[PDB]
Ligand binder design. Sequence first.
Ligand SMILES: CC(=O)Nc1ccccc1O
Length: 150
Amino acid sequence: NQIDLNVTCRYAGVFHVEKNGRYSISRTEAADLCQAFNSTLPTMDQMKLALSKGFETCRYGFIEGNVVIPRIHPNAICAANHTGVYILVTSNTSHYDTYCFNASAPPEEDCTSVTDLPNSFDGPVTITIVNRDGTRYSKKGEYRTHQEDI
Ligand SMILES: CC(=O)Nc1ccccc1O
């Protein structure tokens, strides 16, 4: 009973979380997941500030109200070569990665690793935070509050 959460640098508190190496998070799960990091789904303004500090990914993820990809450098296979906060307009499907926002993080680029999941609750899952540098933090718990996400 294991969940891997690949996390990134935080940029103005915003970071990306990919679950189990595939697009697999629902919007309800995403809010609960960010809450386990003492975080919330970023607003579009929080995400735009994170973008301005150096944040970009090549994955769709929830923010408050939309599913987006922050892009700095045009890349043909990432958000169709767009720059800025690219908003997904048309999709059949509901599961993506998520972005999270931690107001207590540093104001600009924080590329230290994540070494805790401070607000997860008691549960049976071995949850492993995987950093981009491969360092890991694991803890037994749960973060999902909606049965349909389990
Ligand atoms: C203060 C701070 O940097 N908190 C935080 C941010 C992202 C993931 C886990 C964390 O504990």
